[PDB]
């Protein structure tokens, strides 16, 4: 489907001294950067990491994060010494953009605090969210004075990503666009009864993620059955597990049914027996 | 201190006594990132563990994958033992192979 990168960042403020600064990069759901603070690098994690980029590129990227990431670092701390607030601060920016097949290309930089969004650089500038208390206003006058990092964040986001992405995309395709058979498995839950029983369907090891999974009987899906989170494996399948919580009896002829586009339209059916 | 942590115990494979598996906790939702996570054999701290780079999702909290090969058996009982800063105790969360 659509494959946006999105660049993670997470800045942890537990006093005016101590600051630790992460970030990854996601290309769908496939992790394809790191960047530890125990580091002066970016670790491409695919060998398609790079693009079509070459090291000279490549190694300047390098060097401009290590600025950014100390500007942003004091920066925040200006601003909380400003705005007067209080330590400990949990700053997350999501940033990226996802090429479309194959006219536009749409962008974001959403920025949060305390795992609230506050702002977000919408057109030319730095808005607020609507939400946002009044000092992220006061922080909005500031940043948007700033005419150089403005004109430097929408170049990136309207230039340097989509050109990027758009290489990604190309030599890292193959391994996107892959589909990856689940396995499913029965087993008996924890009794919701007596005299109950807690019907549970396991799928495991499916790619990409879109899956469907419902218990059945015959063809009438079971409204009552109940699927947990989309949980990941470290080999980038997943794992889910759908539940029905139904009287003894009503086991048998049960049936749990798997669909995912892997399968090509042969559904996995098994049976409670 | 906001949100807390959901703890969600795993295996890659469906169990087997005395056969290759891996063993997944999922660590998701909570909020701040500062976290501690240990997976659990007996009881006893796991040290060849394998976790994933912290991230989030859409709404901001943070989630963690931990994982390590391992083989079942009848006595085993593995777990995962989580603590945060919403937690007043660490809180574990056991394999159940059925569940
Ligand atoms: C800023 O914070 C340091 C502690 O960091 C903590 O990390 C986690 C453990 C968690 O508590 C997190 O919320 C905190 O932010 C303070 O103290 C110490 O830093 C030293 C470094 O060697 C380390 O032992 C610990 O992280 C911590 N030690 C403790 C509390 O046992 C710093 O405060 C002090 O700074 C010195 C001037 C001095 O006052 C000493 O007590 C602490 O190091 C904080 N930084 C500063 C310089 O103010
Ligand atoms: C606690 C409240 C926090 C609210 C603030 C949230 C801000 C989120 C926005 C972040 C945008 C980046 C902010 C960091 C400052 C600049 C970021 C950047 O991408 O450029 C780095 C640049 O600032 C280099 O250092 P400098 O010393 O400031 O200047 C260099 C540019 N000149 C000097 C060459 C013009
Ligand atoms: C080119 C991939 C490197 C991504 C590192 C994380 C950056 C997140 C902050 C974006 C401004
Ligand atoms: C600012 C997000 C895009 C960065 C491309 C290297």
Redesign the interface.
């Known amino acids: 489907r659509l494959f946006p990168l999105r660049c993670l960042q997470i800045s942890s403020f537990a006093n005016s001294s101590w600051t630790r600064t992460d970030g990854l990069a996601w290309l769908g759901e496939l992790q394809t950067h790191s960047w530890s603070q125990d580091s002066d690098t970016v670790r491409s994690l695919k060998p398609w990491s790079q693009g079509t980029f070459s090291d000279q590129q490549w190694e300047t990227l390098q060097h401009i994060f290590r600025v950014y990431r100390s500007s942003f670092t004091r920066d925040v701390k200006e601003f909380a010494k400003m705005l007067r607030l209080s330590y400990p601060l949990e700053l997350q920016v999501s940033a990226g953009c996802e090429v479309h097949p194959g006219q536009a290309s749409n962008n974001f930089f959403h920025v949060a605090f305390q795992g609230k969004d506050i702002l977000s650089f919408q057109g030319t500038s730095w808005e607020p969210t609507q939400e946002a208390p009044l000092w992220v206003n006061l922080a909005i006058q500031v940043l948007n004075q700033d005419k150089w990092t403005r004109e430097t964040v929408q170049w990136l986001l309207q230039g340097t990503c989509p050109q990027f992405v758009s290489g990604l995309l190309e030599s890292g395709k193959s391994e996107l666009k892959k589909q990856v058979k689940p396995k499913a498995w029965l087993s008996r839950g924890p009794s919701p009864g007596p005299g109950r029983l807690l019907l549970v369907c396991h799928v495991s090891g499916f790619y990409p993620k879109p899956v469907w999974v419902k218990w059945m009987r015959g063809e009438q899906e079971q409204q009552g059955t109940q699927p947990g989170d989309i949980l990941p494996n470290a080999d980038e399948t997943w794992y889910l597990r759908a539940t029905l919580d139904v009287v003894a009896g009503e086991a048998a002829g049960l049936s749990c049914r798997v669909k995912h586009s892997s399968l090509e339209g042969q559904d996995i059916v098994l049976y409670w027996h | 201190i906001?949100?807390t942590p959901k703890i969600?115990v795993?295996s890659?494979?469906?169990a087997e006594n005395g056969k290759s598996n891996?063993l997944?906790c999922?660590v998701?939702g909570f909020?701040?990132?500062?976290i501690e996570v240990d997976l659990l054999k007996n009881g006893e701290r796991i040290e060849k563990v394998?976790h994933?780079?912290?991230?989030?999702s859409?709404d901001?909290?943070?989630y963690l994958?931990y994982?390590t090969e391992f083989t079942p058996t009848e006595k085993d009982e593995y777990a995962c033992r989580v603590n945060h800063v919403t937690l007043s105790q660490p809180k574990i969360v056991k394999w159940?192979?059925?569940?």
């Open positions: 906001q949100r969600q795993y890659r494979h469906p891996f997944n999922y998701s909020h701040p990132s500062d394998e994933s780079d912290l991230s989030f859409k901001w909290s943070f994958l994982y159940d192979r059925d569940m």
